[PDB]
Amino acid sequence: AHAFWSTQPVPQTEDETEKIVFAGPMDEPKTVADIPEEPYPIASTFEWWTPNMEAADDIHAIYELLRDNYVEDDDSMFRFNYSEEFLQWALCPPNYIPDWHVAVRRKADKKLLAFIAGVPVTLRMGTPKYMKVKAQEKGEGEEAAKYDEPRHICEINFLCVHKQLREKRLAPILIKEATRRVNRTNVWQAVYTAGVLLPTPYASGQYFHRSLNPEKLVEIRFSGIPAQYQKFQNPMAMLKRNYQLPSAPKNSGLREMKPSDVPQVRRILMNYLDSFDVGPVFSDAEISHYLLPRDGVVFTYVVENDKKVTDFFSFYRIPSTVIGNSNYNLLNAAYVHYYAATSIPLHQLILDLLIVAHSRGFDVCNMVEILDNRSFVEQLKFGAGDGHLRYYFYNWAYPKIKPSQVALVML
Numbered sequence: 001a002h003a004f005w006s007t008q009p010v011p012q013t014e015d016e017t018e019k020i021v022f023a024g025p026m027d028e029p030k031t032v033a034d035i036p037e038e039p040y041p042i043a044s045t046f047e048w049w050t051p052n053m054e055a056a057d058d059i060h061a062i063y064e065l066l067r068d069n070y071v072e073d074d075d076s077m078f079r080f081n082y083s084e085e086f087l088q089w090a091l092c093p094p095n096y097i098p099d100w101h102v103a104v105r106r107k108a109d110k111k112l113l114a115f116i117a118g119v120p121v122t123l124r125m126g127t128p129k130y131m132k133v134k135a136q137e138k139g140e141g142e143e144a145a146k147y148d149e150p151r152h153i154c155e156i157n158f159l160c161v162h163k164q165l166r167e168k169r170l171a172p173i174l175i176k177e178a179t180r181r182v183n184r185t186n187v188w189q190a191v192y193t194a195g196v197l198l199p200t201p202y203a204s205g206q207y208f209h210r211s212l213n214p215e216k217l218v219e220i221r222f223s224g225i226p227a228q229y230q231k232f233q234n235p236m237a238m239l240k241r242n243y244q245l246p247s248a249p250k251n252s253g254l255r256e257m258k259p260s261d262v263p264q265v266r267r268i269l270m271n272y273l274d275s276f277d278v279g280p281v282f283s284d285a286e287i288s289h290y291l292l293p294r295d296g297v298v299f300t301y302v303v304e305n306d307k308k309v310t311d312f313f314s315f316y317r318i319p320s321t322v323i324g325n326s327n328y329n330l331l332n333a334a335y336v337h338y339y340a341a342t343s344i345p346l347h348q349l350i351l352d353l354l355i356v357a358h359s360r361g362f363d364v365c366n367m368v369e370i371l372d373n374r375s376f377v378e379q380l381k382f383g384a385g386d387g388h389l390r391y392y393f394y395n396w397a398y399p400k401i402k403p404s405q406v407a408l409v410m411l
């Protein structure tokens, strides 16, 4: 009972994905020549729009659609409020393709109704290690290695239909058109994540949260006071004590990342990431873009001892609209980004991320159990959340992998 997804080059059931042995495409080979020159048809009262992401008002129109219409919980307590500066950062990495940003406007008054974005990413997506072992056992080694080389693909994000236009089958149309525009650039795979179950994920991970401002979080009902705190005279005071953090970082020689750090950071990030089955490949220009501090958006610190960069961590800001509470309008969240540690334990490095995030006024720290995120959950007092992030490929058969074999952070 998937009227759109049953027509698409993706695995259809869990049953199917459990059979998948090698990495490779699902669909027949095509060329740009085969792909329609003309945009996908839509009703006369609508039009396709390619927004200019370097133009303030275009960014602003995207910003407003998402502020009022993007991801919210079922209870309508919190909705994502990605800033305009964030969207510019996310949608314009080095060598991005303007045409990959796809919008629907109604022809009359140019009111924004729908959006999807695609950005290029170089991604390793060859057969995972545990299946490459099985391939060596069966003498099927060449088939498994076929697609080992890093692939220049599309990363899809920010799919959004206006609340007044939900359940009108407009989302398939958006995906079709995005797929068209990407295929026209000779790109045949995409990667995307979603908090919902679609057919069919290659990886799934729980969310984890670390309270930095427990009193605000309880007030806005993001989290509750655990039942066991009731056996105390002052439950909230104990909760504040529990999550309290040092005012300053502990690691001597921690500082913000500068441009000269680019090659050192790239090197240690790539060494670390290459040990995961699925993970991005970053050039110098992409390390600069994604990791250099930008106020209100992305925050990156390095550990520098005796003039050498040995560790770094990064995190990014996504605030959420506090829909129901009157005293607060925003939930200020910090999301664990990329990192690498070579001189110290990971929990020691990430502690400073929590320290820094706290001193900057962040209410909470979020992450999915990808990378080695599980290694510091207990000691830094993260708790599992209710959501799961699922990871998906478009037009790529991939075996099931654990979330700790995923090295791609998605914004």
Ligand SMILES: CCCCCCCCCCCCCC(=O)SCCNC(=O)CCNC(=O)[C@H](O)C(C)(C)COP(=O)(O)OP(=O)(O)OC[C@H]1O[C@@H](n2cnc3c(N)ncnc32)[C@H](O)[C@@H]1OP(=O)(O)O
Pocket (backbone or CB within 6 Å): 001, 002, 003, 004, 005, 006, 069, 070, 071, 072, 154, 156, 157, 158, 159, 160, 161, 162, 165, 166, 167, 168, 169, 170, 171, 172, 175, 178, 179, 182, 183, 187, 188, 189, 190, 192, 193, 194, 195, 196, 198, 394
């Ligand atoms: C080569 C390059 C290829 C590029 C493309 C790669 C594919 C990338 C795919 C996009 C990656 C997105 C990554 C993110 O950004 S994840 C975030 C998605 N956005 C939100 O959750 C924001 C709030 N919601 C909305 O704006 C709408 O409810 C959306 C737009 C989500 C659906 O609109 P609406 O509620 O008006 O429904 P409809 O009648 O138009 O259409 C119903 C069809 O849509 C399927 N549906 C529902 N939710 C999702 C979802 N999150 N991903 C993919 N499909 C989804 C559903 O199964 C059904 O198909 P089928 O079951 O009948 O077959």
Ligand SMILES: CNCc1cc(-c2ccccc2)nn1C
Pocket (backbone or CB within 6 Å): 071, 193, 194, 195, 196, 207, 387, 388, 389, 410, 411
């Ligand atoms: C990776 N991008 C941020 C995000 C997170 C979620 C989400 C939604 C519901 C449950 C868990 C995660 N959706 N989106 C779009």
